[PDB]
């Protein structure tokens, strides 16, 4: 029995063009624990990506936060790409400043 990850992509603070912020990708609700998460800038992998220590919820499903420092703009597109055993292909969630 396996559980697919829920994914949210969002910023630490409300987005303001040209102001330094943090881009987060929160993965949760998954099982087993192995998971691959990439943060993307204009479709390419961001290199400086940190993550939280593996933990889990009362229902035993795991969660992780992946995050990087970023300066949003009108032009630049950001996303989170996730792979897990439950997924046939990587799942890409775009950053939408309204969500």
């Amino acid at each position: 029995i396996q559980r697919t990850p829920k994914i949210q992509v969002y910023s630490r603070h409300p987005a303001e063009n040209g102001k330094s912020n943090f881009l987060n990708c929160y993965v949760s609700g998954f099982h087993p624990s192995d998971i691959e998460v990439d943060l993307l800038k204009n479709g390419e992998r961001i290199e400086k990506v940190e993550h939280s220590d593996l933990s889990f919820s009362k229902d035993w499903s795991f969660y992780l936060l992946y995050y990087t420092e970023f300066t949003p703009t009108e032009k630049d597109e950001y996303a989170c790409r996730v792979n897990h055993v439950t997924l046939s292909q990587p799942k890409i969630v775009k950053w939408d400043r309204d969500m």
Partner: protein, 275 residues
């Protein structure tokens, strides 16, 4: 207010890729304060909150010794689980454990916890009486019999009523500025037209701690549970949490909708509307 301490262990087997990884994390409420990872270059119980850093070498040495012993126990438990479930040595399996104590404002024990899971399903749990067990299946009933013979519940009860509550009280004092501070949510309502006929109203709660919050939409004073899209509370990365709730409303009817927010940091529940 009320508080908790919890430790979470995860032991994951990975046959052909070495010994099972063992990772432990400790929390006070929604604040992580320690970690141990057998995959670190130099495995050690390590601080993850500023208020625990003051603990001396005897603390860090003692916790590291205990974690290394737990990693060995859980690697053995993963071997035992294969026997109990008639499983091969080829697959990857996971044991999870979560234990700790809840205290009230006076720091007295409200409840203790000690439970485990195998492959993400409940395995065995110490009952609220801290004196008996609930086994999920016939494999866990074997462990229950072993643990009743060995009077394991008595040992756990001593930890939960003693060292667990005493150290949680110490951490709450040492970390009072943060652990005992609730940060209320910063709230606002945004409006996003979908078409000429509908728009989305989204109620935001940002910057709050602890994570527990209730965000709901009402229409003419009636809760809109089925029609509300409610995202999981998510960490911001600065200790705080975020959440939003959204409803699709007919154009021009926005004033019939109200967002209701409840949080420990709010002396009274809030009511918000669009503009």
């Amino acid at each position: 207010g009320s508080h908790s301490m919890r430790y979470f262990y995860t032991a994951m087997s990975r046959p052909g890729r070495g010994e099972p990884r063992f990772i432990a994390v400790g929390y006070v409420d929604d604040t992580q304060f320690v970690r141990f990872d057998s995959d670190a270059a130099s495995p050690r119980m390590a601080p993850r909150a500023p208020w625990i850093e003051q603990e001396g070498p005897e603390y860090w040495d003692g916790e590291t010794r205990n974690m290394k012993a737990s990693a060995q126990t859980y690697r053995e438990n993963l071997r035992i689980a294969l026997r109990y479930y008639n499983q091969s040595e080829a697959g990857s399996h996971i044991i999870q454990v979560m234990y700790g104590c809840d205290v009230g404002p006076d720091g007295r024990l409200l409840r203790g916890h000690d439970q485990s899971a195998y492959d993400g399903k409940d395995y065995i749990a110490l009952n609220e009486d801290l004196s008996s067990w609930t086994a999920a299946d016939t494999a866990a009933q074997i462990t229950q019999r072993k643990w009743e013979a060995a009077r394991v519940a008595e040992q756990l009860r001593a930890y939960l009523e003693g060292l667990c509550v005493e150290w949680l009280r110490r951490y709450l004092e040492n970390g009072k500025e943060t652990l005992q501070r609730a940060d209320p949510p910063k709230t606002h309502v945004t409006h996003h037209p979908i078409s000429d006929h509908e728009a989305t109203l989204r109620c935001w709660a940002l910057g709050f701690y602890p994570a527990e919050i209730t965000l709901t939409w009402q229409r003419d004073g009636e809760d809109q549970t089925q029609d509300t899209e409610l995202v999981e509370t998510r960490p911001a990365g600065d200790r705080t949490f975020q959440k939003w709730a959204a409803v699709v409303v007919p154009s021009g009817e926005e004033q019939r909708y109200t967002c209701h927010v409840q949080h420990e940091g709010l002396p009274k529940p809030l009511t918000l509307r669009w503009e």
